[PDB]
Design a protein around this ligand. Structure first.
Ligand SMILES: Nc1ncnc2c1ncn2[C@H]1C[C@H](O)[C@@H](COP(=O)(O)O)O1
Ligand SMILES: Nc1ncnc2c1ncn2[C@H]1C[C@H](O)[C@@H](COP(=O)(O)O)O1
Ligand SMILES: [Co+2]
Ligand SMILES: [Co+2]
Lengths: 177, 176
């Protein structure tokens, strides 16, 4: 009768990120996911507006809201391979199976990373790395040089995932960090 | 633009200040939760109750519904002009930070002036449910300071009641 779906989702704010490092301020997956949603939405809208995009930006926000949701079952694994992809995908399916059946098909394509189109997938992973970068920028602005190397390698991930909408974002929103 | 700079501060603004909290909730956590609950409410409406709402728009509006808090701090629900007044001021201050070329995209999200009636309703249902869920968490943890607020908000839920909420309450809430 009842679904534990939201009780489990409610746990996201307990799962802390960047564990291998001293954090001036602990970020949890809840804070992370909202920032990714906001950035991923901003990036989609920019693409649409200036760069010929035709992506559903509202949808992209909702995918970003959910992109790390399976952490409530697995915990957070620090980035630094095929097996983790495994558990995570098992974890995402288990979450999906908690949703009442009559709603399953609304939630499955938000939770299950297989469902992301090529362009949705790009935008969300660009937002994710941005947000990870912005974290490094915050920590460093606080004097915390443990995020130094993480900054550098994230600069590599960003250039790999480079786009016009990312360049706009960087030049326009990031320097204030 | 300092806009995204200032949005990243949502995580800094703490809710339920008048009270001891077993766990401190910030606006960033609340907003994600309201967005998730409000999307579900919308999708429940559409799927079970003949709704024709855009649940994704509703999620996006919910993400931004307390965004101006980063300029004002949180403002406890017990004058009501005084808070509604600072509110409009802060929203516009956040709006004027957005690059002009993108302002039309973010302004409606920040200033909330163009919510349909059903969207106002859904997001507010979701905001009160989340406040209620917080009470339930706190009370489970043995925090009796939220007992009063739990009873306040049951009335708030009753007044905003709907078939969607009734579904969510029956299906998702008791697990809390
Ligand atoms: N370079 C580096 N070192 C240590 N931890 C890192 C690094 N980059 C990201 N992360 C962390 C942030 C989260 O704790 C987890 C997954 O990040 P997500 O980006 O959400 O998958 O890995
Ligand atoms: N009954 C009661 N007592 C004390 N504080 C309360 C009460 N109800 C809500 N709140 C608080 C929770 C937030 O800190 C703020 C506005 O949140 P909003 O997003 O507008 O719910 O008001
Ligand atoms: Co992430
Ligand atoms: Co709210």
């Amino acid at each position: 009768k009842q679904s534990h779906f939201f009780a489990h989702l409610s746990r996201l704010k307990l799962i802390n990120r960047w564990p291998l490092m001293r954090n001036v301020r602990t970020e949890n997956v809840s804070e992370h996911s909202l920032q990714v949603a906001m950035v991923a939405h901003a990036l989609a809208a920019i693409k649409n507006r200036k760069f010929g995009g035709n992506v559903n930006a509202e949808r992209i926000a909702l995918l970003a809201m959910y992109h790390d949701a399976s952490a409530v079952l697995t915990g957070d694994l620090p980035t630094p391979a095929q097996e983790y992809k495994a558990i995570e995908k098992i974890a995402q399916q288990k979450l999906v199976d908690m949703v009442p059946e009559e709603l399953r098909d609304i939630f499955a394509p938000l939770i299950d990373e297989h469902a992301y189109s090529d362009e949705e997938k790009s935008l969300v992973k660009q937002a994710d790395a941005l947000c990870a970068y912005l974290k490094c920028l915050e920590e460093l602005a606080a004097g915390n040089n443990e995020f130094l190397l993480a900054k550098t390698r994230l600069e590599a991930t960003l250039e790999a995932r480079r786009s016009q909408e990312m360049d706009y974002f960087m030049e326009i929103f990031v320097p204030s960090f």
